[PDB]
């Protein structure tokens, strides 16, 4: 629901600072792919994969 | 339409001073991408994304 | 929106050219005299009103 | 009497869009202090000072 | 407190009659409006500071002041 | 790499002629100028700096 709650559900709460600094809401995240997520500092494929598939589960 | 109403609609009124100092009109904003917006001090991806998509919705059908 | 735009310039008769050519306000903003001649706006006066209209509307 | 004419007289015409978007009339501006003006985005003390003192004369 | 007044008449008196639909949809009476500040009014869609200011000061004058 | 007066006219920035004359900005000086350097000589609008930078880029290439 909130981006903090979304990350917690994927076990990715430790990524919270990137999302806060870049002002990424769960709605902004919905329009983001691998290239956009690499741009904001999500360097691990596994993390981007979890985020992309996580938004797909909802959206 | 004007920038002040445009920013308010996206909930980005706090960016009003950057737009005023840089004399950014909707015409200028329409040709701006992520690199151009970073140049004027819009450092958050989320803010640039909202601006870019906002102009797309505004000037599209 | 583009229909509202044309109406404001008294150019409502150009609605069909704009619809057929899929010209939105974003497309119109990047168009000059040569591009407008290409879609069939043959009168200078009409192209001038469109170009200056987008300039006034967008800031700008 | 027109907020646009008032702003012009103080050399603060650049502030017109904030006043229009926030629907601030001279009557509204008359009950506004430094805290209320900061709230609508008048971030410079000098600008708030000119506005407050400007309305004080218009009485 | 005597604020049993018609919200339609209240808005008209402030020159804010155009807000009639927000107040009707949200079922805002004068008694509800009396406990509302800038944050609560922003929440129901009253986005202009000037409009919220007029409403808050309008209820104050109807209540005596502050 | 001609007279600066012709360059500004081509971009519709002829009103900037006095800044360029007073600051003794030639096209070769302008070619090494970015957004920070142009802000320093009084070009406060992003749109004007953008037009100047991109204008010299086209001239060079």
Author numbering:
A (entry chain E), D (entry chain B): 1029 to 1087
B (entry chain D): 1029 to 1089
C (entry chain A): 1030 to 1089
E (entry chain C): 1025 to 1090
F (entry chain F): 1028 to 1088
Can you list sentences taken from the study reporting this PDB entry?
The poly(ADP-ribose) polymerases (PARPs) Tankyrase (TNKS and ARTD5) and Tankyrase 2 (TNKS2 and ARTD6) regulate Wnt-β-catenin signaling (Huang et al., 2009). The two Tankyrases are highly similar (Hsiao and Smith, 2008, Smith et al., 1998), sharing a set of five ankyrin repeat clusters (ARCs) for substrate binding (Guettler et al., 2011, Seimiya et al., 2004), a sterile alpha motif (SAM) domain (De Rycker and Price, 2004, De Rycker et al., 2003), and a catalytic PARP domain (Rippmann et al., 2002). Tankyrase polymerization is mediated by the SAM domain, a small helical fold highly prevalent in eukaryotes (Knight et al., 2011, Qiao and Bowie, 2005). We report crystal structures of the polymerizing TNKS and TNKS2 sterile alpha motif (SAM) domains, revealing versatile head-to-tail interactions.
We also crystallized the TNKS SAM domain, which again required a polymer-breaking mutation. TNKS SAM D1055RT1, equivalent to D902RT2, produced two crystal forms in space group P21, diffracting to 2.5 Å (crystal form 1) and 2.9 Å (crystal form 2), both with six molecules in distinct asymmetric units. The TNKS SAM domain was highly similar to that of TNKS2 (left). For both TNKS crystal forms, non-crystallographic and crystallographic symmetry gave rise to left-handed helical filaments established by EH-ML contacts. The repeating unit consisted of six SAM domains with pitches of 83 and 79 Å, almost twice as long as for TNKS2. Unlike for TNKS2, where protomer contacts relied on crystallographic symmetry only and were therefore uniform, the TNKS SAM EH-ML contacts varied substantially. This was apparent from the merely approximate 6-fold axial symmetry and the variable tilt and twist between adjacent SAM domains. We conjecture that the variable relative orientations of SAM domains reflect filament flexibility. However, the equivalent residues (D1059T1, K1066T1, and K1081T1, respectively) mediated binding between a subset of protomers in the TNKS SAM crystal structures. Thus, contacts not seen in all SAM-SAM pairs are still generally relevant, probably occurring in some, but not all, configurations of the flexible filament.
